Scaffold this motif. Sequence first.
Motif, mmCIF file in Angstrom:
data_model
loop_
_atom_site.group_PDB
_atom_site.id
_atom_site.type_symbol
_atom_site.label_atom_id
_atom_site.label_comp_id
_atom_site.label_asym_id
_atom_site.label_seq_id
_atom_site.Cartn_x
_atom_site.Cartn_y
_atom_site.Cartn_z
ATOM 1 N N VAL A 111 0.827 -1.203 0.000
ATOM 2 C CA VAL A 111 0.000 0.000 0.000
ATOM 3 C C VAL A 111 0.863 1.254 0.000
ATOM 4 O O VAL A 111 0.488 2.278 -0.580
ATOM 5 N N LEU A 112 2.030 1.198 0.646
ATOM 6 C CA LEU A 112 2.975 2.302 0.527
ATOM 7 C C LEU A 112 3.577 2.363 -0.869
ATOM 8 O O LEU A 112 3.974 3.438 -1.325
ATOM 9 N N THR A 113 3.644 1.227 -1.561
ATOM 10 C CA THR A 113 4.277 1.171 -2.869
ATOM 11 C C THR A 113 3.307 1.337 -4.028
ATOM 12 O O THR A 113 3.747 1.343 -5.181
ATOM 13 N N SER A 114 2.010 1.474 -3.762
ATOM 14 C CA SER A 114 1.041 1.536 -4.848
ATOM 15 C C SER A 114 1.068 2.864 -5.589
ATOM 16 O O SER A 114 0.573 2.937 -6.716
ATOM 17 N N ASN A 115 1.643 3.906 -4.995
ATOM 18 C CA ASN A 115 1.632 5.241 -5.574
ATOM 19 C C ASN A 115 2.917 5.579 -6.323
ATOM 20 O O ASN A 115 3.386 6.720 -6.253
ATOM 21 N N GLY A 116 3.515 4.611 -7.010
ATOM 22 C CA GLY A 116 4.680 4.871 -7.827
ATOM 23 C C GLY A 116 5.996 4.950 -7.087
ATOM 24 O O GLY A 116 7.052 4.916 -7.734
ATOM 25 N N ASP A 131 6.351 10.629 -3.975
ATOM 26 C CA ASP A 131 5.788 11.941 -3.678
ATOM 27 C C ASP A 131 5.517 12.057 -2.169
ATOM 28 O O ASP A 131 5.940 11.222 -1.367
ATOM 29 N N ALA A 132 4.794 13.092 -1.742
ATOM 30 C CA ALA A 132 4.068 14.054 -2.571
ATOM 31 C C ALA A 132 2.734 13.529 -3.098
ATOM 32 O O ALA A 132 1.932 14.289 -3.632
ATOM 33 N N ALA A 133 2.497 12.230 -2.926
ATOM 34 C CA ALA A 133 1.226 11.617 -3.285
ATOM 35 C C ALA A 133 0.722 10.599 -2.284
ATOM 36 O O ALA A 133 -0.485 10.349 -2.253
ATOM 37 N N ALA A 134 1.581 10.003 -1.465
ATOM 38 C CA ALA A 134 1.183 8.894 -0.623
ATOM 39 C C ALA A 134 1.754 8.925 0.783
ATOM 40 O O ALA A 134 1.674 7.907 1.477
ATOM 41 N N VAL A 135 2.349 10.035 1.217
ATOM 42 C CA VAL A 135 2.814 10.120 2.598
ATOM 43 C C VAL A 135 1.628 10.165 3.550
ATOM 44 O O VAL A 135 1.583 9.434 4.550
ATOM 45 N N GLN A 136 0.632 10.994 3.231
ATOM 46 C CA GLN A 136 -0.611 10.994 3.990
ATOM 47 C C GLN A 136 -1.394 9.704 3.782
ATOM 48 O O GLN A 136 -2.191 9.323 4.643
ATOM 49 N N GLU A 137 -1.182 9.024 2.653
ATOM 50 C CA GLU A 137 -1.835 7.742 2.432
ATOM 51 C C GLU A 137 -1.276 6.672 3.359
ATOM 52 O O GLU A 137 -2.037 5.959 4.022
#
Lengths: 275, 95, 88, 131, 71
Positions: free
Chosen positions: B29-34, B68-74
């Motif tokens: 799940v940490l790796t799903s955002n590229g 990113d920048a795209a998945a830290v909050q994820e």
Amino acid sequence: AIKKYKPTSNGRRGMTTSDFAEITTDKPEKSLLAPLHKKGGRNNQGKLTVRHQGGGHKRQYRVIDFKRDKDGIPGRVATVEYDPNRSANIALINYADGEKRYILAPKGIQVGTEIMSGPEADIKVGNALPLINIPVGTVVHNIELKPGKGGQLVRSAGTSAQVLGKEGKYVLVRLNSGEVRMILSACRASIGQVGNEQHELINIGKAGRSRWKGIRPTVRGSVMNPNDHPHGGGEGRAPIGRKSPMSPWGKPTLGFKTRKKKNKSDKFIVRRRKN
Amino acid sequence: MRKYEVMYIIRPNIDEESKKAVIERFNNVLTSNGAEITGTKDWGKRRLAYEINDFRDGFYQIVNVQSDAAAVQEFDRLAKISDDIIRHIVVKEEE
Amino acid sequence: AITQERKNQLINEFKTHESDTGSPEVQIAILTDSINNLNEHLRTHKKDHHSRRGLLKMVGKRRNLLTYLRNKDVTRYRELINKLGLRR
Amino acid sequence: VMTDPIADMLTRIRNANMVRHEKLEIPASKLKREIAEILKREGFIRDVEFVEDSKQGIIRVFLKYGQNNERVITGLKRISKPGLRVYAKSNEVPRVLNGLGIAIISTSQGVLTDKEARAKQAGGEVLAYVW
Amino acid sequence: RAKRRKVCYFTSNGITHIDYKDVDLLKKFVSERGKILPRRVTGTNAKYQRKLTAAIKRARQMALLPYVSGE
RNA sequence: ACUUGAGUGCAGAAGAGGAGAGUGGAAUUCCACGUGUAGCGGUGAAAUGCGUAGAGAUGUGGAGGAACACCAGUGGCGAAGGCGACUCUCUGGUCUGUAACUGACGCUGAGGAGCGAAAGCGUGGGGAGCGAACAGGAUUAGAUACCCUGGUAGUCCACGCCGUAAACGAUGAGUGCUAAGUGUUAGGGGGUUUCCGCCCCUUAGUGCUGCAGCUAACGCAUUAAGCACUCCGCCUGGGGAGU
């Protein structure tokens, strides 16, 4: 949002209607309209047992899952629509089955959001799952009591709950107005506080909107004849004479507790009614 | 994006292969955002000072994620309510 | 902002001389785009008075440079204004 | 900054005029140049040697005041305020001091002195006044 | 004369750490009862006490060094 | 025309500058249960108050709010008011360094615009501590006070209005110059130094001690109240009366 009306006449000088931004389309689904009859406070006998109802506009009910029995298959919010039967709005959902279901609308949603409903489902606002899998401290509405009955619990506009901390059985819930009820654990529930949060600040303004809804007016205590209401009497605007204010039946209505004392809810409260 | 060096410990009541499932799925799940997470670590069963949820010590963990920048909050918010990850403190990485 | 693709990208898309990093049309370009992105990024949370005072000082500086370029070259200042879009 | 150049030079020769410094700097300009030749030719400072170079400037005069406290630069005043300008006609060109000092009115043929400008008999902008 | 005893304590062999992976210099920094060390008695610089204090906090947030101690 | 002014670039450095979200403890209150008895509490001395309905203390657990001790310091940042646990997103600004470009594009600025502690004001939330008005007891001749025991609004949050303070450095902003020493952060160049460290030169910011000079005296003094220039605001005896 909430607009306010400029005082063009004296009907307008306080009145507010909500902005109607949350809604998208007007003409609802024809295939889930259930018809209604305003009953008017009547009984099955015919007597009017509820005071001062009646007078309303022609409502028409739209069928709502307050259960979300179907599971796993994600929804996809098509439209969020308005329903005169309650405060909050309803979001139309196109499931992938084709089972177009009006389902109660939490805030923060728009068109296009995925809404699953399994026990596996997310904590994205809208997804629904039984109370065991809910973690300690989420904003929850649409709580039921017996498993699969329907969302009797919280539903009205701009309300919510919590989960304080649970066992296998039961799941504690700080409900709205502070009652902490040991609600059963396999009870299906859904996630989010209920949309259209600004229903309370709607200033009604003119008299007949309470007749538009509708609500018949009420006649107070020291106004009716001393026959009909047990405050009335005097030589006009007499003080509220008898000790222990009293309803139009002989029961005091300042704080006289009306829960059954021998009742099932003696175990199902940790903390009640902060007042 | 920027480097996000966020490492949040695993629960001490976890089983062995279930803990490997928790690192596997949580890493997915940490790796799903590229973010090709170019770092890893496993500091072992190391006792903390006070309790996190119920332990007197836990199974410490680390991370090294470059995305990113795209998945830290994820990865922080989507793991804030898990039962394995006790308390994930995802510190920024600019050392 | 501004991102490096808009710093070097915008200076590369609006370089007045072949090796002129300044050239006050270039300063109006970089300050203008950074003022716009600071305008949306100030509008996203409309309580922060510090970033707002930055937006007022930056937008005022870009206006003063716009009047400077308008006083320095007339037709080139009209072409920079009508090409940039703002100032209207 | 840079409110007035001649007031910066006059504040330079004043503040250094009380500091007891050997040499004094300045911003090199046509007013520091022609005022350096006038105020140096009248015998206040030792020598102005305008050591020019890129980009601008820069004059460098020496205080020609001996042991006795307060030499030929004994006190200077901005007789013309850049901001509210002085003026002086032919007959109204005032000679500052009375018998000791000398004023420098920027005449229409060069930055004259007091008595030499009265010798031309034509006034102009009152450039500075060295009491 | 003319310096401080325990001369700068991090500038000799630093810098720019730690913070999370470090527990060693963090072990020598956070004081005996539990508090952070005084910057006069420990002997760090300006930026040294700033970085060791920020990493002392950020290493106290993930349960590494104790948020309280014994007496 | 030119480049130091001012700006852009390039590379550094730094901070409680701001806005939003999330998280964490120490402590107080309250609650549930164990343990236990006759006091706890407060003071100048007492009393009100609480306590045999089992208090204080102590052990465990839970809920909730508010503020983040140690680092922390005539430290840092900001236009000022001010800003402190930790993490992230979005963002402004400052200084250093060569020095690529631009070539005066600057300084002030009445109106106008905007922000501005705390008290307040409207609505809706939040109410653990603190706590005007209020209640009781004390001290006094008197106690609408000081003290103690309580206690509402408020403090907290979001959305709007309020636009005052000893809003203080009782010192408007900008620029140039003019003895020195000693601290202190944020940098840079260097003398040898792998280190480290000492020392000089250098900025920028800030504190002390003091020459010239200013002054009514205290005092200021390269962060001037010195020495000059630009511009704005204010002052013309007190009371009446900021009525």
